[PDB]
């Protein structure tokens, strides 16, 4: 558009902030301001416009932005993903019979889980995805460890903090990790490209 200035909305999923800047101003300004105002570290965020990462020196003019366009502030995730998860769109029917229900004894006493063993096709390292039968809670910890082979402990800690701050986890005294309801598990599954696997795990017999 012919306007000299532009209103832009930045959203991180939890909060939205509107900014008015001159179209010749580098977007560095807007990104740093969003991070500062939200009390987040710049290194923990990635800013996208129409699915493309924004570079700090790019201006709204450079990108041909329009008034009230939206910038998405995505959280950082580990750089590499399990090649098992290179297609989020596959139908999950064949994965359901791979799931298994298992009764585990605790001091008070038994609890039923559903699990799905997921093997990295390149390294052959396996991880289990885990579901609690009673409320269909899913271990977000199990999802993250399966999704990101080279994740550091710092990256895992950052992600579990994000889950606590943005989704609706529970703690079970009995079992470690962060457990989330089905809707939250499916939101994470999209983020981790694990949708068919979490679909299967959620539908499987307990």
């Amino acid at each position: 558009g012919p306007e000299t200035h532009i209103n832009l909305k930045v959203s991180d999923g939890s909060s939205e902030i509107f900014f008015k800047i001159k179209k010749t101003t580098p977007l560095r300004r807007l990104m740093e301001a969003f991070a500062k105002r939200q009390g987040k570290e710049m290194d923990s965020l990635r800013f996208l416009y129409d699915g493309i990462r924004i570079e700090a020196d790019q201006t709204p003019e450079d990108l041909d932005m329009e008034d009230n366009d939206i910038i998405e502030a995505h959280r950082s995730l580990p750089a590499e993903r399990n090649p098992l998860y290179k297609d989020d769109t596959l139908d999950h029917t064949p994965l359901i019979p791979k799931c298994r229900a298992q009764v585990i004894e605790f001091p008070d006493g038994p609890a039923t889980f559903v699990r799905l063993k997921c093997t990295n096709p390149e390294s052959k390292v396996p991880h289990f995805l885990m579901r609690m039968a009673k409320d269909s809670s899913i271990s977000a910890t199990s999802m993250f460890r399966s999704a990101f082979p080279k994740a550091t402990q710092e990256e895992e800690d950052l992600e579990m903090r994000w889950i606590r701050d943005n989704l609706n986890p529970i703690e079970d005294k009995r079992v470690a990790g962060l457990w989330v309801p089905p809707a939250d598990a499916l939101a994470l599954a999209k983020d981790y490209s694990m949708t068919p696997f979490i679909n299967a795990l959620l539908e499987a017999s307990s």
Binding site: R100, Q102, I104, F113, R115, K117, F128, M130, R174, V175, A176
Partner: peptide, 17 residues
């Protein structure tokens, strides 16, 4: 077979408390 090991494996990882 592998099923039993998977069962034992899984119980082990769940109880990683």
């Amino acid at each position: 077979g592998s099923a039993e090991e998977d069962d034992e494996l899984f119980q082990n990882y769940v109880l990683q408390q």
